[PDB]
Amino acid sequence: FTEDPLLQGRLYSYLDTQLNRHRGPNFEQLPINRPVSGVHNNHRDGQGQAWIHKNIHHYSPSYLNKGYPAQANQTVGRGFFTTPGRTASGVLNRELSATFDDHYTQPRLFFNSLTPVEQQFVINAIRFEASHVTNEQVKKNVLEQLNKISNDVAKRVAVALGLEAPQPDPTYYHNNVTRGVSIFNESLPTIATLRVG
Amino acid sequence: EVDARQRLKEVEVDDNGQFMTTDFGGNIEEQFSLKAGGRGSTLLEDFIFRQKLQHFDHERIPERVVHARGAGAHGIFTSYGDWSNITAASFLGAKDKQTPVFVRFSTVAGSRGSADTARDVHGFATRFYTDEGNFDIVGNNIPVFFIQDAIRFPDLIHSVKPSPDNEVPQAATAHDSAWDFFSSQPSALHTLFWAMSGNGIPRSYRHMDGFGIHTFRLVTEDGKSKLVKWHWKTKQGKAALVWEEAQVLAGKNADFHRQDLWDAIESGNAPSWELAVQLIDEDKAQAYGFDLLDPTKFLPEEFAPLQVLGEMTLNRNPMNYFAETEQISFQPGHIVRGVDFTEDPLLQGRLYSYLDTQLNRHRGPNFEQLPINRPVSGVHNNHRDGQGQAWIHKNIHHYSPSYLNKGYPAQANQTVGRGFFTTPGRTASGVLNRELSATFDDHYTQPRLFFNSLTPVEQQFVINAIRFEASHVTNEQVKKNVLEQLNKISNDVAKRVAVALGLEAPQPDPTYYHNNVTRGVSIFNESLPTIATLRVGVLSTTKGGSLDKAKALKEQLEKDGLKVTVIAEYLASGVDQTYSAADATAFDAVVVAEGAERVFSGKGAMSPLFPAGRPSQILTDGYRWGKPVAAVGSAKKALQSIGVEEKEAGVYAGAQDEVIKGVEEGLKVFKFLERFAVDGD
Amino acid sequence: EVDARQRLKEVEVDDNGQFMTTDFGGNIEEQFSLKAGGRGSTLLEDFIFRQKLQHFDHERIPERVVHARGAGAHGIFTSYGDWSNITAASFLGAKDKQTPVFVRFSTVAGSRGSADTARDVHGFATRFYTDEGNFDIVGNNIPVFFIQDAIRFPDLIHSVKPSPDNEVPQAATAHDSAWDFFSSQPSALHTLFWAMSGNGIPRSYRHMDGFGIHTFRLVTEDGKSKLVKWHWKTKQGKAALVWEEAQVLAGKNADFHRQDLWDAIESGNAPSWELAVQLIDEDKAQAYGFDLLDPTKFLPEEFAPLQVLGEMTLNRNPMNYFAETEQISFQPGHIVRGVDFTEDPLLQGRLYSYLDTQLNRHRGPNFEQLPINRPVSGVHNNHRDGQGQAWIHKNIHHYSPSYLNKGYPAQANQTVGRGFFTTPGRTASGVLNRELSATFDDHYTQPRLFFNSLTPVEQQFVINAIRFEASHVTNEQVKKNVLEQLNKISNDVAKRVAVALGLEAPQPDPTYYHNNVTRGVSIFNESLPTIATLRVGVLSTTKGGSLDKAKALKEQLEKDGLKVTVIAEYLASGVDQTYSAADATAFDAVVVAEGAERVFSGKGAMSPLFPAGRPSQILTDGYRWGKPVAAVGSAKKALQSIGVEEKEAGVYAGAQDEVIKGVEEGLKVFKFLERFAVDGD
Amino acid sequence: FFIQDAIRFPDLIHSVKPSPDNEVPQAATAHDSAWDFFSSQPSALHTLF
Amino acid sequence: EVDARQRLKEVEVDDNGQFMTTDFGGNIEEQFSLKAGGRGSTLLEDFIFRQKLQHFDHERIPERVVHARGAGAHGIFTSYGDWSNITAASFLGAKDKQTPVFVRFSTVAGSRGSADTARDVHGFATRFYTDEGNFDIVGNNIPV
Amino acid sequence: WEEAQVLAGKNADFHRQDLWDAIESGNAPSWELAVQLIDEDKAQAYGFD
Numbered sequence A: 001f002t003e004d005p006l007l008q009g010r011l012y013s014y015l016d017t018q019l020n021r022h023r024g025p026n027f028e029q030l031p032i033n034r035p036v037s038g039v040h041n042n043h044r045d046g047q048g049q050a051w052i053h054k055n056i057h058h059y060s061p062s063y064l065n066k067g068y069p070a071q072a073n074q075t076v077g078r079g080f081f082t083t084p085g086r087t088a089s090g091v092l093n094r095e096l097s098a099t100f101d102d103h104y105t106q107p108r109l110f111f112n113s114l115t116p117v118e119q120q121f122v123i124n125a126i127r128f129e130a131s132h133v134t135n136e137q138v139k140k141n142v143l144e145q146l147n148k149i150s151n152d153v154a155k156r157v158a159v160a161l162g163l164e165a166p167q168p169d170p171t172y173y174h175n176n177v178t179r180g181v182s183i184f185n186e187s188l189p190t191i192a193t194l195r196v197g
Numbered sequence B, C: 001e002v003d004a005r006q007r008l009k010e011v012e013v014d015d016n017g018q019f020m021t022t023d024f025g026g027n028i029e030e031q032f033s034l035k036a037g038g039r040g041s042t043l044l045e046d047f048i049f050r051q052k053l054q055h056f057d058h059e060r061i062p063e064r065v066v067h068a069r070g071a072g073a074h075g076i077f078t079s080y081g082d083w084s085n086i087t088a089a090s091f092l093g094a095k096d097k098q099t100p101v102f103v104r105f106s107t108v109a110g111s112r113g114s115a116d117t118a119r120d121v122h123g124f125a126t127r128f129y130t131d132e133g134n135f136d137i138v139g140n141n142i143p144v145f146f147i148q149d150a151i152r153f154p155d156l157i158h159s160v161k162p163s164p165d166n167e168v169p170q171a172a173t174a175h176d177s178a179w180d181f182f183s184s185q186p187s188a189l190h191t192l193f194w195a196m197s198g199n200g201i202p203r204s205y206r207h208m209d210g211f212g213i214h215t216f217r218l219v220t221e222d223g224k225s226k227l228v229k230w231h232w233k234t235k236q237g238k239a240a241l242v243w244e245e246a247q248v249l250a251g252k253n254a255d256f257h258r259q260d261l262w263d264a265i266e267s268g269n270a271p272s273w274e275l276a277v278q279l280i281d282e283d284k285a286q287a288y289g290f291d292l293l294d295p296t297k298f299l300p301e302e303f304a305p306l307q308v309l310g311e312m313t314l315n316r317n318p319m320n321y322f323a324e325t326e327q328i329s330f331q332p333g334h335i336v337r338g339v340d341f342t343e344d345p346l347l348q349g350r351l352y353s354y355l356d357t358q359l360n361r362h363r364g365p366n367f368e369q370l371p372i373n374r375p376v377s378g379v380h381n382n383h384r385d386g387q388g389q390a391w392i393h394k395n396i397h398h399y400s401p402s403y404l405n406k407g408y409p410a411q412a413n414q415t416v417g418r419g420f421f422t423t424p425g426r427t428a429s430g431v432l433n434r435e436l437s438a439t440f441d442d443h444y445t446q447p448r449l450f451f452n453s454l455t456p457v458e459q460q461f462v463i464n465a466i467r468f469e470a471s472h473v474t475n476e477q478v479k480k481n482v483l484e485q486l487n488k489i490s491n492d493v494a495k496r497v498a499v500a501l502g503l504e505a506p507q508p509d510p511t512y513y514h515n516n517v518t519r520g521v522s523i524f525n526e527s528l529p530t531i532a533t534l535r536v537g538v539l540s541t542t543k544g545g546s547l548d549k550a551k552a553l554k555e556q557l558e559k560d561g562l563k564v565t566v567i568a569e570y571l572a573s574g575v576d577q578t579y580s581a582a583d584a585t586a587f588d589a590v591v592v593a594e595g596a597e598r599v600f601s602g603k604g605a606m607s608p609l610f611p612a613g614r615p616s617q618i619l620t621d622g623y624r625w626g627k628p629v630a631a632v633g634s635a636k637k638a639l640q641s642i643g644v645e646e647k648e649a650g651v652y653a654g655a656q657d658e659v660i661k662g663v664e665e666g667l668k669v670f671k672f673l674e675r676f677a678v679d680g681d
Numbered sequence D: 001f002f003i004q005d006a007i008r009f010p011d012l013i014h015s016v017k018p019s020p021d022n023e024v025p026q027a028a029t030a031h032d033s034a035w036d037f038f039s040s041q042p043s044a045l046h047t048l049f
Numbered sequence E: 001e002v003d004a005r006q007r008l009k010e011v012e013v014d015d016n017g018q019f020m021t022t023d024f025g026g027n028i029e030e031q032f033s034l035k036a037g038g039r040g041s042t043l044l045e046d047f048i049f050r051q052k053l054q055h056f057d058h059e060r061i062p063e064r065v066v067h068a069r070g071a072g073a074h075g076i077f078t079s080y081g082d083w084s085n086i087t088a089a090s091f092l093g094a095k096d097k098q099t100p101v102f103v104r105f106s107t108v109a110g111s112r113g114s115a116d117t118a119r120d121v122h123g124f125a126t127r128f129y130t131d132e133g134n135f136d137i138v139g140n141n142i143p144v
Numbered sequence F: 001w002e003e004a005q006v007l008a009g010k011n012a013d014f015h016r017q018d019l020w021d022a023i024e025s026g027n028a029p030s031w032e033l034a035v036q037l038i039d040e041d042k043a044q045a046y047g048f049d
């Protein structure tokens, strides 16, 4: 793993949520969830336990089980290991890094890298969905944030909402472009399974 | 003037003007995870993150095994008189006696998230929070059900629900397994016909009748009883959509019926139903050509007329959908003194199933303690413990009989304590059997009665519906089995349906044919008693002062009680909705404002603000779906573009005053059936 | 003088003077099944039977994974001072500030039905229902714990609990797997020694001290931190039983501790504890010969004396055991503003474990909504839904940040809203590792420090306890491994344990040997400050008018606060208990009333009313287990029948005034250690 | 993805999911609460596009 | 020599000479928590800790509402003859016909952990794993 | 009874240990399945039901 704060929380969330769906800790024993590599540990009991463990000495360390199931690491047993070089440094903090501050540059980069008609579909999508918002101040907040991404996009979306979000705010405007973000630009490599009426 | 949800106020939580906290108290923040450094890993000691996420991760509960898709609201039932002469039920025991109620409407097959406007049997579940316990009338909008025995319910539901290999199709009976079961189990044919008619695709929950379906018993104080059928009579009038409209509406707005019910209550237009009953003696069980214990049969009103007992009105929406609507647990076993069951084999099995299924949904025994499930009459018994036990019992002697508790809580029966009692006259006699009675054998006579009692155009909708669904069946032999069973009901129906499938229908089978007709099984036949809350789409334009007089048209229509939406290119001053967000399915009548012809024609109909031909598509769809259409002044050229003349019925072209008068009276007719073709030219 | 359970009143249900009902209301009777005929089968439509039985069938919930066997009660905590300069905790915020509390005591390994007097570590879980959220101190009666890392907890518990093939032995560490783990994981040796001493078999919950074990942080409002250890000091004084006594008591009265706690509060003799703390500087974490993050170590009071914060008193028993005691959900993660965690690896893993395990017991995320689990300070957040959602939230905008809800519920931190905050000065540094610090490596020094601080007879009890349990170990190499680890702590202890096992003790290993002693780790050392609620068994007889003297003897003893029990052959006037129902384990002292010698000889000790030699066995057991024993007047013959001299320590003989004065004095000594032999002889 | 920290995940979903009072609209972000969150939380703008 | 637990052999797990793994496979060590520093706090990304502790935390299921305290064993039932003249039961359908069985004995009132030698009515429940479905004779040591 | 009380404390696992040891030591216990057959018309013929 990495120190992505979004990834960090998922690790907890996805394991916990299975307790709700499956109503037990033995959801991995389900045929679709089972691995092909085998399972050997000191986990016993729980709801819907499907196996019958033969090892009565279900703990580590132990003389009676001769140290089996055994510990595996980087050098022995081909076990999992965290990257040796990874380190922690600094104060314990409930805050995001200053490097996470930019929210407007890449959105514009994506919009720049689309075709003229694709750019219209994106605006038409915002035009459609933004009109369903009943609260006036919320629509003003939307155009205010859209104006930071692009002035033309803010103004074009604004005309459908029946108001102005005009005055440019060029803190984050640019003309850079990147490959492969578009869909309608390229042609399909195969027409197999395509339907004809 | 008393609030319907008054009892639920004590459990309500106001978070306004407060700091964020945990579930165990103490003020907190929850917008940042605790990290080991500026760009560090999240700590396990972060209790604020885990307590927040754990609750989110465990939000979902299992949906209902059937009727997963639905919506509801609170209300008040009022009894018109003292009905002690026919029943000992306390909620019907006095004139002007009011009882709080909660009603939940639903479809059947579709899962949570499925469309409201899918073709299906609909649910009509009503609870009476009476002063002698909760009484539930769990019913449907169709007076008969598919099967005759409750043991066959999983077989019915497995067949109609999506195929288990791919889980397709969603919320639809138009597939092999469904029509395999209808042909293999021909008792289901009757409910099939109702489901293929207007009852399958109703306008809204407000425009449905409701039925208890089963024959129940009403018992007096002395033990004497009478057989009873429950009926909910809509005061808004019956109304139904067309199928081609219903399909489009499913995608355009899957929340059509629940939002309709919500907007009606919020706007001060609370829907109401009258509670009616068909009362007959015990000796009439097998008197009218069928068995009253058979749930696949209804009792014609010619043999037993409707007797109105009271009126229910739904006037309060829920504040939290999940806590109230989703969590509510209806049961046909929820019975009170003055009522009793019958030996209907389908009903008999439901009493077990509904109590059992709550163990799965609520994951514990204590589901009646939930605010929405609680009665207003009080709960006193020796039930202890269980998961989520909300109370603390004071009586340490939780058993009976007992000297230590002084005989309390005490036993109650017919003579003492106004306790429930089974009808004393009821008897059992005969061998223990796994059989059905010989009186249940006729599966074709009533389906024919229902088909005969529809209008020619209504008969066409049922046939066209069968044609549509039967054509999706891949298996050839299954389609032959379907036409074989349809032929037993009617040869003409089997002939016409066979045309679409490209098969030859079998020769006439005159065993079950008849020309009888019955009262009150129709829809597109009778006009609505009120056009209040009906929706009108005013197609206008931003260019050339067309929007000014469209607002005047809107203003006049609102006085009569109509919900109006002015359509334009963008949300200008007076514009409610854009053409991009507009569709014909969301309106009962489409009106073209004067000066709005430009958007139907050349330059103006192809603006980037909406898809190509959107203004013209709305009026065209509205006309093809039978809705009263109109066009004010020079807007009659808009009708000329789509090819519709200004003479034919349901089309109103002229001045503003004439259009309003024509549109309003057109909404009473609702659907104009002369635009739909019948078989044979 | 406020009621500690005043918030709980609103969820109490009284069934007195009421008729029996269902869970959904409506009066009923439930003593007869609905049958089809006089001798017929039970009907499925019988809703009264199934609704009653369903709740009974689903009564049980999963027991606690550990500390399953336990009991508790409500109370009030009172702060002795304003403690703002050391902590921001509100419940320690002012002098004479009262906060409600619930405390639960427990064993560890035994299941819900196990004996109270089994040898084990005892739980001491205390909750503070403060005005800024629930604060829990989940502690034990022993200051140190077995393991150093929380990931090893399943390994510890699996080893001590019954063998998974036969589930034997119940509530006991006297088997192969337990001592295999203790010897294989040397860190567990310290808590072992505590467990083998009087702390393993305490007199009652009221005669136990309590410890938080882990080092926590006390944080001030300005953000200055101090390392802290929690201590509960009993005002009843420490007291413990002997092992041979505890074994018999486990069978005679399994409910000994919970009945004792119940009777003390009921009689009006409420127990009390003083909340004390050891304050250490942040730079003195590794300055006392060990690491303060290590949970296997305790800090001697010579280095840091206790600072008394306040007093707790338990004065209210629960109305319902299940609803209150069984359902309460303690968590070390229940922390409030003013307190913070540390980097103890055992504590770090607990924070996850306790919140997670509630999903098992309560089958849902809304366990904090249960009456016993609710805070008194209010709950406001964007948590919605979940299994058994009890409230109805009014705020439709259940998210943040948000304009629509106007930033409510608002965020709270250190300077705003008095929200929780981690110690500002804390930091992290180094590589991400799956290791334990080298400062944790000493496993043998403090166990030796504990043993040195016990009295000779107390040291013998520890060795005799090890002798008993180690002899049950069938595997010889496991017993050899135990002696090897015991030898590292002390050679003398190893040799004295080896002789009972018949094995040659290993040669001395002086690496960790020392002669240091510490204060306050003893029990029998001290005398009791009060003798209230203590139990005296008056052995009398129904013949010869012995009850008159016994009644006058009882009347006097009860005036000093003692609970006296007059024993006879049968329940005559003034007789509390029969000889058949009586046992020495139930009493703290045994006094033979005058004229009750007849029941110790031939006929008289051979009555059909009780087993042979019962009266003599009670006195023999009482004397052999070290209790104060007495005999009034001619009752001296009874002491001579069992070979006990009348003038030794804790043996009183003479007139009524002399016997009463002696026994009351002997109960303060409680246990006479001179009747227990020490090694060498 | 919309958000930068995982603790904000319930806030994101609650806003995009149907309104809790009526459970409307189904499978759509075209309503007040969703666009209130997107504007109030600018990090979501990229995935929105 | 017939093994009563022959059918159960397929679900048996042997951990002798094996490495430690998770419940989703892949070898691991599970004696040290992942820490951010030598004396640091435990990381939330320690998947090995939580997967191990989650299974421990959820080990317990609810005990039986009655007959909580009990113990059982496997066996073999043998019919002495063909009892077709009195019953159509398949397991009593022929002489020397063997059927596997499992018997659990118990008390009534006591919860899990209670003593065996407490005074109570005792359970005697026997299952017959017959060739035409499971047949249970759930009984007691007292006839009434 | 006086034996049973002390045994409950000394060895709570008395019966399950006894059953286990019997099977391990090669002393498997046995029971004979017996039945009392009565005719349908004699259900209330022996002074009770």
Ligand code: HEM
Pocket (backbone or CB within 6 Å): B064, B065, B066, B067, B070, B104, B105, B106, B122, B123, B124, B125, B138, B139, B140, B144, B145, B149, B150, B151, B153, B212, B213, B214, B295, B328, B329, B330, B346, B347, B349, B350, B353, B354, B357, B358, B361
């Ligand atoms: C004509 C007879 C029937 C009628 C009128 C009917 C109607 C309904 C309705 C309206 C609901 C939704 C209740 C709500 O609003 O929450 C429902 C759900 C349900 N139905 Fe029926 N149904 C019938 C037949 C059956 C049968 C034969 C069975 C099986 C014995 C059955 C089993 C169920 C179950 C288990 C639920 C879910 C209840 C819950 O989760 O609360 N139904 N039915």
Ligand code: HEM
Pocket (backbone or CB within 6 Å): C063, C064, C065, C066, C067, C070, C104, C105, C106, C122, C123, C124, C125, C138, C139, C140, C145, C149, C150, C151, C153, C212, C213, C214, C295, C328, C329, C330, C346, C347, C349, C350, C353, C354, C357, C358, C361, E053, E057
């Ligand atoms: C300082 C060492 C520990 C102490 C003093 C301690 C104390 C306690 C106490 C008193 C209880 C019973 C609470 C009650 O009265 O209801 C308990 C239960 C429990 N303990 Fe611990 N414990 C310790 C270590 C651990 C560790 C390391 C773990 C694993 C990470 C753990 C996991 C649990 C669990 C899952 C429960 C059941 C909680 C419930 O069901 O409410 N404990 N512990």
Ligand code: HEM
Pocket (backbone or CB within 6 Å): C057, E064, E065, E066, E067, E070, E104, E105, E106, E123, E124, E125, E138, E139, E140
């Ligand atoms: C007629 C005399 C009865 C006998 C001989 C009897 C026998 C038994 C036995 C042997 C068990 C434990 C089964 C095992 O080994 O796991 C048991 C448990 C149980 N008993 Fe009975 N019982 C009787 C009456 C009843 C009655 C009248 C009820 C209520 C209708 C009842 C409800 C239960 C329940 C719910 C269990 C738990 C079953 C489980 O969780 O697997 N018993 N009984």
Ligand SMILES: *[C@@H]1O[C@H](CO)[C@@H](O)[C@H](O)[C@H]1NC(C)=O
Pocket (backbone or CB within 6 Å): A105, A174, A175, A176
């Ligand atoms: C792309 O444009 C950005 C503006 O945000 C600029 O900072 C950067 O130098 C450009 N990179 C190139 C050369 O692609």
Ligand SMILES: *[C@@H]1O[C@H](CO)[C@@H](O)[C@H](O)[C@H]1NC(C)=O
Pocket (backbone or CB within 6 Å): B411, B412, B413, B414, B415, B416
């Ligand atoms: C109702 O119960 C009463 C006793 O409370 C009893 O005397 C009476 O017979 C019962 N009623 C009937 C009609 O069975």
Ligand SMILES: *[C@@H]1O[C@H](CO)[C@@H](O)[C@H](O)[C@H]1NC(C)=O
Pocket (backbone or CB within 6 Å): B289, B445, B513, B514, B515, B516
């Ligand atoms: C039709 O109605 C008539 C009423 O005249 C009735 O006698 C008859 O039984 C009904 N059924 C058929 C199939 O004719």
Ligand SMILES: *[C@@H]1O[C@H](CO)[C@@H](O)[C@H](O)[C@H]1NC(C)=O
Pocket (backbone or CB within 6 Å): C411, C413, C414, C415, C416
């Ligand atoms: C707490 O929140 C406030 C805003 O409410 C902010 O000004 C402050 O920086 C935050 N942190 C601290 C340390 O108070």
Ligand SMILES: *[C@@H]1O[C@H](CO)[C@@H](O)[C@H](O)[C@H]1NC(C)=O
Pocket (backbone or CB within 6 Å): C452, C453, C454, C455, C517, C518, C519, C520, C522, C525, C526
């Ligand atoms: C026993 O005596 C006193 C308590 O009465 C105590 O201070 C002392 O520490 C104890 N003895 C030892 C060796 O610890």
Ligand SMILES: *[C@@H]1O[C@H](CO)[C@@H](O)[C@H](O)[C@H]1NC(C)=O
Pocket (backbone or CB within 6 Å): C289, C445, C513, C514, C515, C516
């Ligand atoms: C024992 O006490 C002495 C004197 O306080 C101290 O110097 C030493 O560190 C302690 N530890 C041992 C085991 O010697």
Ligand SMILES: *[C@@H]1O[C@H](CO)[C@@H](O)[C@H](O)[C@H]1NC(C)=O
Pocket (backbone or CB within 6 Å): E081, E082, E083, E085, E086, F037
């Ligand atoms: C049934 O037949 C068996 C032998 O096959 C015989 O021993 C037994 O007496 C018969 N039982 C009855 C009751 O007829």
